Amino acid sequence: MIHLYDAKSFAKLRAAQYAAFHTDAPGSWFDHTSGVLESVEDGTPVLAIGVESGDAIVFDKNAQRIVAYKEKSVKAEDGSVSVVQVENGFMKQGHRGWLVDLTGELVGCSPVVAEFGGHRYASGMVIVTGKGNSGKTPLVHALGEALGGKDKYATVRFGEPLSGYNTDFNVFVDDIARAMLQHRVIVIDSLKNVIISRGAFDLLSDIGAMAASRGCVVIASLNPTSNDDKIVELVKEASRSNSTSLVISTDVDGEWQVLTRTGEGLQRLTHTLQTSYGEHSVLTIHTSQASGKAIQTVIKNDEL
Amino acid sequence: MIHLYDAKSFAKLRAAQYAAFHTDAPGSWFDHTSGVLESVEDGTPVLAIGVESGDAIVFDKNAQRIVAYKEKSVKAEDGSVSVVQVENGFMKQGHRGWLVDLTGELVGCSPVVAEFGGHRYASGMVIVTGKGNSGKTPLVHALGEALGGKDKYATVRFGEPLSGYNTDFNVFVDDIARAMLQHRVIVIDSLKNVIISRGAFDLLSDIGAMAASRGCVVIASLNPTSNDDKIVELVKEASRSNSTSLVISTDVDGEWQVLTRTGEGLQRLTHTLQTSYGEHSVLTIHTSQASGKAIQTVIKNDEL
Amino acid sequence: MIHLYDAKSFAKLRAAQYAAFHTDAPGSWFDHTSGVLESVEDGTPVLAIGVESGDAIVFDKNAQRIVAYKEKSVKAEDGSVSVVQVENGFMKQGHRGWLVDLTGELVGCSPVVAEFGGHRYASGMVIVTGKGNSGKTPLVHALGEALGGKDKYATVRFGEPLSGYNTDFNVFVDDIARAMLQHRVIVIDSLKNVIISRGAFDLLSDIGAMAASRGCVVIASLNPTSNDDKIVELVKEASRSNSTSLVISTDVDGEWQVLTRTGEGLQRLTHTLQTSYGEHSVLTIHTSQASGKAIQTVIKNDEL
Amino acid sequence: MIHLYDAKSFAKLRAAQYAAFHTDAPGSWFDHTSGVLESVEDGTPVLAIGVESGDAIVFDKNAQRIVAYKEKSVKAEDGSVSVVQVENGFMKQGHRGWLVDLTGELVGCSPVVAEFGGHRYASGMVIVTGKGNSGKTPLVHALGEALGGKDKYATVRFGEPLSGYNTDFNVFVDDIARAMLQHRVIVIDSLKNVIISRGAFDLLSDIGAMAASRGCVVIASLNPTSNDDKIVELVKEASRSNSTSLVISTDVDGEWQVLTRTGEGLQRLTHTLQTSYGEHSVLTIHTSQASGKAIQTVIKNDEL
Amino acid sequence: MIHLYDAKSFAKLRAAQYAAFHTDAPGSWFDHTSGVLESVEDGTPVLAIGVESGDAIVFDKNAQRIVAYKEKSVKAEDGSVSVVQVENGFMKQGHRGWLVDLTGELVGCSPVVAEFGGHRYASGMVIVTGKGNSGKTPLVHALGEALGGKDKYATVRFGEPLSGYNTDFNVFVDDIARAMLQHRVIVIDSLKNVIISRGAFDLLSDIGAMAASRGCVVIASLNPTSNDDKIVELVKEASRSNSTSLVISTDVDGEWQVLTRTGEGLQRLTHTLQTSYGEHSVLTIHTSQASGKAIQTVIKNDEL
Amino acid sequence: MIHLYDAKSFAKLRAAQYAAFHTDAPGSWFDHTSGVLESVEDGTPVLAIGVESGDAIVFDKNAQRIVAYKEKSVKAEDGSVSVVQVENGFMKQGHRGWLVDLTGELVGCSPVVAEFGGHRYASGMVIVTGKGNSGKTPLVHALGEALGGKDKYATVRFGEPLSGYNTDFNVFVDDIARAMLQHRVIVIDSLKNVIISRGAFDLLSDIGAMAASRGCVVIASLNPTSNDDKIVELVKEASRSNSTSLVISTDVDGEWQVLTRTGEGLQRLTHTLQTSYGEHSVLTIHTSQASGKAIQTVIKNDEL
Numbered sequence A, B, C, D, E, F: 001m002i003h004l005y006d007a008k009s010f011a012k013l014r015a016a017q018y019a020a021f022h023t024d025a026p027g028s029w030f031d032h033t034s035g036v037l038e039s040v041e042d043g044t045p046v047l048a049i050g051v052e053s054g055d056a057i058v059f060d061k062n063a064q065r066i067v068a069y070k071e072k073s074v075k076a077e078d079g080s081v082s083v084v085q086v087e088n089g090f091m092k093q094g095h096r097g098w099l100v101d102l103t104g105e106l107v108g109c110s111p112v113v114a115e116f117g118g119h120r121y122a123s124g125m126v127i128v129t130g131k132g133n134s135g136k137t138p139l140v141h142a143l144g145e146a147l148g149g150k151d152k153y154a155t156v157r158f159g160e161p162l163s164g165y166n167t168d169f170n171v172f173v174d175d176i177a178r179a180m181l182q183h184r185v186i187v188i189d190s191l192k193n194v195i196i197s198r199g200a201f202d203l204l205s206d207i208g209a210m211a212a213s214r215g216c217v218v219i220a221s222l223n224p225t226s227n228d229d230k231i232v233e234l235v236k237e238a239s240r241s242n243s244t245s246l247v248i249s250t251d252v253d254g255e256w257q258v259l260t261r262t263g264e265g266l267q268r269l270t271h272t273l274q275t276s277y278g279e280h281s282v283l284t285i286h287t288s289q290a291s292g293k294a295i296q297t298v299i300k301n302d303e304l
C-alpha cells in the first residue's frame, strides 16, 4: 500500500530497517512470516507467481495450487482494496507476489537471513556471477549449506543438459513457489534459460521482493559469458537492480566478492570470501565494509 | 479543450501562468482542485489511468475504483463532447487523465507546490536522477518531507528487491492514482521497472500533466546507469520532456541541481542544493537563476 | 480522383497553382471552403481522421461526431465512386481526409493563408523546429497571432507535463479535427508525443493535405533534440515531406528561417525572421528567395 | 502459367520479345489489351490489387469494384486451374494481378509504349529518382505529356501536404487500378508514403508486371533523400528490381539518365535527356546505348 | 523416417549414394520416381507445399489440388505413423514435402539428373548467382535447355516487372509444385522476391530436398546485389546450405563456376563453364575437381 | 522436483554423480531407464516434446503418440503434484520432458554412455561443430558407430537438400522422440534448420536434459559458418550451455577436440581425436585432461 511520513515517522522507519539487517536475530524474520502463513485460513491464496504466458498461478500456505477461488476483497489500511479471484487454475483478479501481508508497516528491509564466518547475509535474491575460472555451481551449493546452518537448503534445478533437470518454465515457477513457502535457504541452479517471455520478465522483477518479504534467501547462478551486449546488459541490470545481494568472482581463482544491499536507502556492504575444493568438487568457504555507487559500477564492468 | 486567443487574451494568459508559479501562495492550487473534486457528484468518474495492457481503470473522488458506469456525455465550452462509460472494471469510453475539468481556462501552468529554503518548487513530475555516488532514494525522501512541510508526504514503492515492495504494474498505477487524489506531495521510489508495455508508456506521458493539473508534486527516482543507448536515451527523454522539473546529481558528493519549468513558454530556473547525512542514512537538505536550452542539454549529457 | 492532362490543360493548372499562392487574396481559399462546407446537407459526413488504433472517427460540418450513418455512395467525375458509412462511432466505409470535395480540379496548391511583415504564408502544415536556444513555444504562439491577423487563432495543446494538458491521442485528433473545421489559423503545441501508433502515423501523413485543402494553417512545434537516429530521422522526414512549410531556428538567437512549398512542382521560397521578447515571454516577430533542393537538405542537417 | 521450351521455341520467344520492344508499333500492345479487356463478359473480374491490409479488391473492365462474385474456375493450357471468388467486396479466391489473360505465350516483354525524341520507351514501371537539384515532380509530368503524345496522361496524386491530395492508401490503389484499366500513360506523384504495410509491399512488387502486361507505363517519382540505410536500400531495390525503367538525375542540373530493361534476359539500354523550364515550372524535355550490370550498380550508388 | 546402421550397412549406404551420382544413368532416378507416383491410388495426396501464410496446399499425382481428404494414417517401417487430412483446401494434418515415400532406404543422395559437355549434374536445387556483368537469366535458360537434353525444360516465372509475370507467392508455389510433379528440369526465374513470409522460409528450406527426392533439378536465379548484410547473408546461407549445387559468376565475363554436392557426407565437385551469346541474347554453354570447405567459403565471399 | 541437502547428503550426491560418469559400467544407465519405461502401465504418457507452435505432443513407452488421455495426477516426494492430460493430440496439462521419473534423487549426472579408444563418453547432447575443412557429417556417423559399439545407431535426418530428407519440424521432433525412446546412440544430421520458432527454442533447451536423463547420447551436427553475429552467438550458446559435450574441429585437418561435462558442479574433461577417410568417405576414428572455464571460452572463439 502507500505509506505517509513526516520527519519523525521516517526516522523511525529507517532505524527499524537498519535493525532488520544489523541487529535482529538471523532468520527471525523468516520464522515470523512462517507463523503468519500458518495462521492463514485454510485454502486462502497466499502467493501468486507468473507462468510463461504472463498469467499467474496461485498457491495456498501448503504450496498447493488453488484452482478455483471465488472473488473476495479486503480493504487495506490506506483504504485501498485487495481482490483475489481464481478460475480454472488462473488468477482472474489479484496481483503477483504475496497475497497476504507479511511485513506490514515494516517495508524496505533486507531481513538478516543468516550469519556465517563473521558476516551477516541478507534475504531476498543473491545472484552469483562473474567471468573467469571460479566455478559458480559449486559456489551456490556451498553458500546454500553455509547459510542453511542447522537447516537443510532447498535446490531448484532448471535448464542444464544434465539428468533429471526440468527445462519447463512453468514447472520451474511451481518449484520456486514451493521453495519460498517452505524453506529459508534456496539455491537455483541456472537462471540462464530465463535470461524473453513475459513470465521470465515477471520472475526477474518479482523474486527479490518476494524472498525479502518472506525472509528467505534465493541464491541464483547467472553466467554472463555471452558476448551479446543485448543479453549481457540484461545480466548486469539483473545483478544491479533485481538482486538484493551480489556474489561475483574476482581476478584470483577461488576468491569472491559479496555486495549486500542492507535496506531501503541504506549503504551497500562488501566483504571477500576465500574458498577451496575437497573431493568430488565439493567447495568450502573459509571462515576466520561500506562501498560507494561508483565502486558498484566498477564491479559491474567485470562482466564485459 | 481548444482555446482561442488574440494578442490581449494571450498576454493575460501568460501573466496568469507567470503568477501561478511566482506569486500564488505555495500549494494554493492543490487546495483549489481539492475543492473542485469534492464538489463532484458521488460515484462520478474523475480520474482514468492506464494499466499494463493499455486499458484504463477509473476512480471516483474518494479514490475508489468504478467498475460500472453507464454512458454519460458532457458538452464542453468549445462545443466538444466528453463521454465516459465504465464496464466490467474498464473504461469503455473516455480518455486517460482527469475526467473532470480542474483547470478551466488556466492551462499551461506549473502551480507552485511549495516553498523551501528560499526556493519555489513546482507541482507536476520531478525526476531525480544522475550518475555518481550521490544517493537518489535518500534524496527523494528528504525532498518529500521538505516540500510536504506541515503535511506528511505519500510514498509509492515499486520494483525493488526489498521487503514489502509491490512489483505488479497494475497495483502501481492504482497506488499512484489514489495518491494524486489525496496528497499534495508524492514520492515514487523506483520508476526503474517502468523504463516497455503500453501502460508504462502511457504512465510516462501522462503523469506530469495529471499532477500539474492537480497541483500535487510527484518526486520519482530514475537511475540512468545502464550503458544501453536504447534505455539511456529513454531516460533523457523522460528527464527532458516528461518531467516538469529535474533534480540531478553533480560532480560533488551531496550536491544536486534543480531545473524547473515555470510554465508554458516560460523560462526554466535552476538552483543548487547541498545535503548531508544524519543517522540511518536520513538525508537533510541544507537551507541558508534562468537557464538557456543549451545549458539544459549540457546537463542531460551527464547521463552518459 | 485522377486527372487527365495535355500540354495546354497542364500549363493552365500550373498557372492556377502559382496564383493560389502568389496572387490570390490572403485567406480567400479558407473563405471559399467555409462556403462549401456550410452548403453541405445537414448530417453529411465531411471529415474523417484516424484515432490511435488506426480506425477513423467522422465529423459533420459543425465539428460534431457522427456515430451512425448508413451506407451512401457518390459517383465522381472520373467515374469513381465514394462510399461513406459510419457504425457505432466508427467509419465502416470511406477514407481518411475530407469526405466532401473542397478542391475540384484545383489540386496541388498551397493556398495563401495570410500575409504578414511583407511575406505571404502558405496554408497546410508548418513545422517549427530546430536545435539551439531559440524557444519554439513562444514562436508558434507569435506566428499564430501574426497569421491570425484580425482573427483569433486556435490552440491545441498536447503531451506536455503542464496543467490542463490533454495527453490522450484520441482527444487530440478530435481537437485537431474541430480546429480545422472552424478556424483558419491553428497552433499545435507539442507534436513530440506523436513522434509509433497507426493513428500517429496517419496524422503525420494526413494533416498537411487536410489543412492545405481547407486553406487553414496548422503551426506545430517539434523538438528534434533526442540523439537517437531512429527518431531524429523521423523528425527530418516529417519536416522534409509532411510539412507544407518549415520554420527552423538558426545560429543566431531569436532568428528563424521560413522555407515554403508554394505549390505542386513549384519552387520553395525562403525568408528570415527576427524576433524579440516582451513581458512574460510574449514573443514579437519583427516586420520591416527561391531555394534549391541542396540548400534544403543543408538546413535539414541542422537537426543532428 | 508455366511454359515449356526447347532450343527452337526458346529462340522464337526471344525474337518475339525483342520485337515487342524494338520493332512493334509504339502503343500497339496497349491497344491490343484494350481490345481484350473490352471483349470480356460483363461483370467479369479483370483486375485484383491489394489494399493496405494485404487483402485484395477486384475490378471489372470499367474499373468498377466487384463486391460479390461466386466461385468460378477456368482451366489453363498447362492444365492448372484459375479460380476467382469475391465476397463482401474482397477476393476470397484468386490472385493479385490481371485476372484475365492479356499476354498468352508472349511473356517477359517490355512492350514499347511510345517513341519520343528518337527514343523508344517501355511500358511497365518507370521510377524517377536521384539526388541533387533537378526536380522530380516537373520531370514526371513532362514525361507523361511526352509519352502521352496524342493522348492525355493520367495523374494519380498521393501523400503530399498539398491541397486535394489523397493520403489514404486504399483510395490510392483504387486510383491506380482505374488508371491502368483506362490509360496508356500514367503518372504517380509521390511513391514516398508507400515507402511498410502488406498492401504497400504488394504494390511495389506487383505494379511493374501489371503495367507491362497491360502495355501502359506508370511513371513514379521516388525521393531517396533519407539517410536511413533501411529505407534507402529499399529505394535502391525498388529502382533496381521492381522498375522496368529508371530515370535518374545526374551531376548536371536538368540532365537525366534513362535506363531501360528491354525484355526478359535482354540488355538494358541507356540514353541522356536535357531539359529546361518555362513559365510556372512547366518542364520541357529537349529533342534533337547498351549498358552493363556493373554500370547499372554504379548509377545505383548515386542514391547514397 | 529414422534409419539404423552398423559399420556394414553404413558402408553399403555410402556406396549406394556414391553410385546414385557417379554411375547411375543420368535421369534414371526421375524415371524411377515417376513410376512410384503413377502407381499411387487416384486422388491420393502426394505432395504438400506451404503457401504464404505458412499453411500448406496439397496435390495429387496429376498436379491437381486436393481440397478435401478425410483423415488417413499409414504406419511406416520404423513404426512411425503418417496421417494426412485435407479440409477446405488446406492440410489439416500431414507435413510439408513428399507425402509418399519416393526414396525408401536410399536417402542422402544427389541423383544424377543429366550429363552435359562431359559433366554430371545433380538433381535438387541449383542456385545461379554472383556479382559482376555475367547475365543470370540467360544462363538459367541455357542450363535448362542443356540439362533438358531431349526433353523440354519447364519455366516458372516470378516477381519481375515484365509482361505476363505472376507476382503472387501462392500462384508461385502452385506452379513449382506442378512443375516438380511433371518435369525433370525446371527453371525458376527470380527467387528475388522470396528473399520474409513463413511460406518463403518454408520454400527455401524445402525445395532442395523435394527436388532431390524426385530426381528433378530446379535451376533458380538469385541476385546478391543488395548491400544489406541482412539479406546478403540470407543469400549466402541459401547458396551454402539450401542448394544442392551452386552456379556462380567469375571475374571473367561469360565464365561460371559449378559447385556440386554429390551426396550425404560426400565431397563437393567443381568445374568451370565458358559461355557466349548468339542472337537475341540466347546464351550457349561451350562444351569441349574435388573442393575443400575452405575453398567453398572463398567462393561465398564473392557475394559481398 | 526440489531436493534438500545438508553437508553430508550433498557430499553423497556429488560422489554418486562422479561415479555415474567415471566408474559406472558404460551404458548401464540406459539399460536401467529402459527397465523403468517398460515397467510403466500401458497407455501411460512417458514423454512430451514441443512441436513448432510451442504446443507439445505426447508419446507412450512404445513411441506411439497418445491423442487422448483424461486428466490424471500424481503426487511426488516433495509433495508436488504432476498432472498430465492429452486432448485432440495435444498436451492440455503437463510439462515438456520425461513424464515419468527416470532419475529419482540421482540428478545432475552425465551417465557414461560408452567407452571407446580408451575414453568414456557422456550421454546427453553432443554438438559437433567448428570451422575449417574437417567434415562434420562423416564425423557424426563415425561417432555414432563407435559409441554404438555392439548396437546399431539411429539416424535422424533433417533439413538438407538431399534425397529423402524430411524438412518439416514436427516430423523431426517425432523422429527424435522415437529415437530417444528406443536407442542409446542417436545421430542428428543438420541441426542447422532449427538454428526461430518456439518449438525450435524448446528443442535446444530440452534435448540435452532429456537424453542425459535417458542415458542415451544425441550426436548433432551444427555448422557455425554464417558471419551473422545474431546466429553465430546462438551457435556458441547452444555449444556452451545446451550441450552435455562438444566435439569441435581444430587447426589440423582430421583432428577433433572433445570437451565433456562430467556432471553437475564437476570439471570438464578434454581429449583429442585423430581420424582418416576410407572408401566412399567412410570416416574412421583412430584409437591408440581437466580443462578450465577460460580454456573453454578459448575454444568457443574458434567459431567466429
Ligand SMILES: Nc1ncnc2c1ncn2[C@@H]1O[C@H](COP(=O)(O)CP(=O)(O)OP(=O)(O)O)[C@@H](O)[C@H]1O
Binding pocket: A133, A134, A135, A136, A137, A138, A192, A221, A222, A223, A277, A280, A281, F263, F264, F265, F266, F267, F268, F291, F292, F293
Ligand atoms: N576440483 C575442482 N578444482 C577446480 N575447479 C573445479 C573443481 N571441481 C569443479 N570445478 C569447477 O566448477 C565449475 C562449475 O561447474 P559448471 O557445471 O560449469 C557451473 P559454472 O561454470 O559455475 O556456471 P555455468 O554452468 O553457468 O558456466 C567449473 O568451472 C569446474 O571447472
Ligand SMILES: Nc1ncnc2c1ncn2[C@@H]1O[C@H](COP(=O)(O)CP(=O)(O)OP(=O)(O)O)[C@@H](O)[C@H]1O
Binding pocket: A263, A264, A265, A266, A267, A268, A291, A292, A293, B133, B134, B135, B136, B137, B138, B192, B221, B222, B223, B277, B280, B281
Ligand atoms: N550514511 C551515508 N553516507 C553516504 N552515503 C549513504 C549513506 N547512507 C546511504 N547512502 C547512499 O544512499 C544511496 C542510495 O541508496 P539506494 O537504495 O541504492 C537508492 P539509489 O542508489 O540512490 O538509486 P537506485 O537504487 O535506483 O540505484 C546509496 O548510494 C548509499 O551509498
Ligand SMILES: Nc1ncnc2c1ncn2[C@@H]1O[C@H](COP(=O)(O)CP(=O)(O)OP(=O)(O)O)[C@@H](O)[C@H]1O
Binding pocket: B263, B264, B265, B266, B267, B268, B291, B292, B293, C133, C134, C135, C136, C137, C138, C192, C221, C222, C223, C277, C278, C280, C281
Ligand atoms: N524572456 C525570455 N527570454 C529568452 N528566452 C525565453 C524567454 N521566455 C521564454 N524563453 C524561452 O522559451 C523557450 C521555449 O519554452 P518551452 O516551454 O521549453 C517550449 P520549446 O523549448 O520551444 O520546445 P520544447 O519544450 O519541445 O523543447 C525556452 O527555451 C525559454 O528559454
Ligand SMILES: Nc1ncnc2c1ncn2[C@@H]1O[C@H](COP(=O)(O)CP(=O)(O)OP(=O)(O)O)[C@@H](O)[C@H]1O
Binding pocket: C263, C264, C265, C266, C267, C268, C291, C292, C293, D133, D134, D135, D136, D137, D138, D192, D221, D222, D223, D277, D280, D281
Ligand atoms: N523554374 C524553376 N527553376 C528551377 N527549378 C524549379 C523551377 N520550378 C520548379 N523547380 C524545381 O522543381 C522541383 C520539384 O518540386 P517538388 O514539389 O519538390 C517535387 P521533387 O523535389 O522533384 O520530389 P520530392 O518532393 O520527393 O523531393 C524543386 O526542386 C523545384 O526547385
Ligand SMILES: Nc1ncnc2c1ncn2[C@@H]1O[C@H](COP(=O)(O)CP(=O)(O)OP(=O)(O)O)[C@@H](O)[C@H]1O
Binding pocket: D263, D264, D265, D266, D267, D268, D291, D292, D293, E133, E134, E135, E136, E137, E138, E192, E221, E222, E223, E277, E280, E281
Ligand atoms: N548479347 C548480350 N551480350 C552481353 N550481355 C547480354 C547480352 N544479352 C543479354 N545480356 C545480359 O543478360 C543479363 C541478364 O539479364 P537480366 O534480365 O538483367 C537477368 P540478370 O541481370 O542476370 O539477373 P537479375 O535480373 O536478378 O539482376 C544482363 O546483364 C544483360 O546485359
Ligand SMILES: Nc1ncnc2c1ncn2[C@@H]1O[C@H](COP(=O)(O)CP(=O)(O)OP(=O)(O)O)[C@@H](O)[C@H]1O
Binding pocket: E263, E264, E265, E266, E267, E268, E291, E292, E293, F133, F134, F135, F136, F137, F138, F192, F221, F222, F223, F277, F278, F280, F281
Ligand atoms: N574422402 C574424403 N576426403 C576428405 N574429405 C572428405 C572426404 N569425403 C568427404 N569429405 C568431406 O566431408 C565433409 C562434410 O560433408 P557435408 O555433406 O558438407 C556435411 P559437413 O560439411 O560436415 O557439414 P555442413 O553440411 O553443415 O557444412 C565435406 O567437407 C567433404 O569435403
Ligand SMILES: [Mg+2]
Binding pocket: A136, A137, A189, A190, A221
Ligand atoms: Mg552452472
Ligand SMILES: [Mg+2]
Binding pocket: B136, B137, B189, B190, B221
Ligand atoms: Mg533507489
Ligand SMILES: [Mg+2]
Binding pocket: C136, C137, C189, C190, C221
Ligand atoms: Mg514547446
Ligand SMILES: [Mg+2]
Binding pocket: D136, D137, D189, D190, D221
Ligand atoms: Mg515531388
Ligand SMILES: [Mg+2]
Binding pocket: E136, E137, E189, E190, E221
Ligand atoms: Mg533475372
Ligand SMILES: [Mg+2]
Binding pocket: F136, F137, F189, F190, F221
Ligand atoms: Mg553436415
